[PDB]
């Protein structure tokens, strides 16, 4: 098991805020709806409200009756995140003791509700009673996407089994998760003619495959059957056959299904007894249907459906391949609803990162690491307000919007949000996981190989070996990454040659001698390491312009792995949003800010102006790096346009990921005088 301490100050703050937020939740309030539906004493507690409202006005903080709600979804994410925080290195010993006690109380409380519910309703024994079993699988009575909500609890239980230090808690989580899988099988055999894939079910196949790994031998086949009930093979077949069926599909609905296809692959290939239990046909389909569907999905998404920050979707859906400008700009800027601002739901990138991660673990292809790094910085890290810890729903791509974050719904950050009842969007629930597990994908151990997935100052150890690796990195503020190795034994360090680096300037020095950048068949350079190894890896950052396939005149700028944004106008977090959907905050457009994002070359064409951008961002470039590399931290990166007219001439471009106090431009409108 990896242990990774994080020395990067921006990521330390991000992770510490999340631990504080997780600690602000009370177990009895998380447990209210489970208890109520199971007939157990609720101790007069209220649920946390918003998407965690239930049907009953006396238990809902806002007093509403049968509101649109997603009961259990955020409780499930909280179990995941509080578990992840036990494994991660942001929480102190004392924070971990308290959060672990809280996790144990929630896991035991849900198990108790499950068991009490099973006696009230034997036919549905094993159901997690977050809401009425009568609305499975399509919802009803204001309860939306039941299987999606249950998926979070089931996924949560696996994380608690994996990461709780409390033996009873692990055993309780396993019993709960296996009993829920048995429920899925019993429910579906009783409702054999009911389609349970038409309504969003989250990553239920994924979670159940993960349950099969933890189940007792005599339960595995039952859990595998449950998992496979949630494999949408008709979708997978289309994808495997090289179709792009995505136009009109809900994006966050779809992505986790393919992570579940990959979990099937992993579950069967990593347990020889399971692998051997398949037919020859089934065995071949692991590769020809499941892996192939996921590989092809990932590729079509990144090539044809992805914005410069690694994100996808508009109004929560995929649209026409390549029509990114159209989706981001031709859907209105009026306040409220889901319009231009509704690009790049943040859940989608949490899911894309998990898909890239399991594709990496199976294939070792460096392209998945390049994507991971890019999207982790420019969509996930970018999603957080560094003062509050809260996270985004949408990420607008058209210029002139602010970033809008959620609220706590707890006494955390009361100086910002006062006594307001929380909302607990999906994006806030994936959000808490993003920051609880923030250090889980820096390095991957595989036999005596150690893959460097991202470049961050950190220290890596693993209980399976006796080497310690300390990385110091600041890219792209400074260009040298160093590694220092201590301990005993040997290993093979695997390094990516980033596409974002100026290729001819990349240099690898190992123990004071330059090494060639020879790649293995998966794209990795390999360095033998042992005690006292010292590596300097020079990665000069490339400045580049990235347009949309459907509009050469809508252009974002990126320096090394950091997408830049222009700071346009001041924003006020108290008034800069409206509502859309179910209690979702959506950004309000600033048309004066948008007007500043016109990039008008003083002389010549837009094409010639773009050609005059230099990769090294030096004097003479049409976009010039202005910060001193040797002063300030990474977020002090700063750029200015040159040879342009109007307001853009005076703007600062800085990292998108750290921009939150102003409206911003990621994509600029290139225009002739
Ligand atoms: Mg796992
Ligand atoms: Na083009
Ligand atoms: Na001001
Ligand atoms: Zn979401």
Author numbering: 379 to 1051
Article, verbatim:
The crystal structure of Bll3HypBA1-NΔ379CΔ761 (aa: 380–1223) was determined at a resolution of 1.75 Å by the single-wavelength anomalous dispersion using a SeMet-derivative. The NΔ379CΔ761 structure contained one molecule per asymmetric unit, and residues M379–V1051 were modeled. A Bijvoet difference density map of the data collected at 1.280 Å wavelength revealed a prominent peak at the metal site, whereas a difference map of the data collected at 1.300 Å wavelength, which is above the absorption edge of Zn (1.2837 Å), showed a significant decrease in the anomalous scattering ability. This result confirmed that the metal ion bound at the active site is Zn2+. The estimated molecular masses by gel filtration chromatography were 91 kDa and 76 kDa for Bll3HypBA1-NΔ379CΔ761 and Bll3HypBA1-NΔ379CΔ933, respectively, suggesting that both protein constructs are monomeric in solution (data not shown).
These results showed that Bll3HypBA1 is a β-l-arabinofuranosidase specific for Araf-β1,3-Araf structures. The crystal structure of GH146 Bll3HypBA1 consists of three domains: catalytic (α/α)6 barrel (aa: 379–820), β-sandwich 1 (aa: 821–920), and β-sandwich 2 (aa: 921–1051).
